[PDB]
Design a protein around this ligand. Structure first.
Ligand SMILES: [Ca+2]
Ligand SMILES: [Ca+2]
Ligand SMILES: [Ca+2]
Lengths: 102, 102, 102, 102
């Protein structure tokens, strides 16, 4: 029953596009890229890898998960600084869409 | 003894509405669902669930609690992206309403 | 060595005033109240109470600290929704004020 | 393995400048001083210190690292309010500069 969320959520209001919710596109590369890195370098599972990635722009909250290696530390910074912007506007957009969707 | 805040804040500032504080309603809907899932899925108590729900889109931080199921992990992930926007705007309007009460 | 931050920072650009930074007043009262609550309920030392209270407006991160009692859990959500906006507007004001000093 | 992000990230969007990204300069100062503090006060390594400093101004999330002494606790609070702004606009300018680069 996580249906009503995924379907009346990420799927449904993710298809409200201006020229400037090409930020979603921008987001997806970056999150995905981070996830790959986390999986490979930090050795974590895909979900956990994704969880960490999502965490560094959003108030969600990383898990037990934190970087243990120098590359993972440094990388987390550089990614984090960028994506924080990206997460924001997208969240705003979706929020906006939700309200005029009822 | 939080009787001060609940009357002076939480049930103070909501009694003030524009068009865009339709956002409250959506946020309410999001949170409730989230909490329910947590209680059912993640087995935690109503508040612990409820706390966790709030934790994900505001910066406060979750202490001990973190999702342990892949299913709940994705639920957070999906749910995270929707609610944050809502949190932002309710956060802002609500804050402004304090300021216009002094 | 914090003196350089404290004087060159949260007072040096704190005293940059319009009418609309009356939120600083509000921030002070609200942060104070929460701190008091934390001190009382959570048993915590005043600094720690203060630490936690600020942790929840800002992207900070609490320490190892988090609400362990039900009232504290309940209180935190309520407070966080209120105070976040305050933290935001003040932050922007203060931010803008560093930049205006170059 | 992060060479994509380092060169095509927070060195690419740097060579894209108006004058109100003097905020990057501000952030560098505040961040650097913070790092200096944390290394010294809290005994941590430089990388860890940097991470922690970043962690208080972004949704990133402090790992194990958090302050343990009053001096550092207070300092975080002070710094936290200051940096929160500078981070935010940095993310924003940076963020837009990604979409303007596509
Ligand atoms: Ca986070
Ligand atoms: Ca926080
Ligand atoms: Ca955290």
């Amino acid at each position: 029953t996580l249906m009503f969320k995924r379907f009346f959520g990420a799927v449904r209001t993710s298809w409200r596009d201006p020229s400037t919710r090409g930020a979603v596109l921008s987001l997806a590369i970056i999150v995905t890229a981070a996830t790959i890195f986390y999986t490979l370098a930090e050795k974590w599972s895909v979900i956990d890898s994704l969880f960490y990635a999502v965490s560094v722009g959003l108030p969600m909250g990383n898990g037990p998960l934190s970087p243990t290696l120098t590359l993972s530390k440094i990388f987390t910074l550089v990614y984090a600084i960028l994506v924080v912007g990206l997460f924001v506007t997208v969240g705003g957009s979706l929020a906006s869409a939700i309200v005029q969707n009822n």
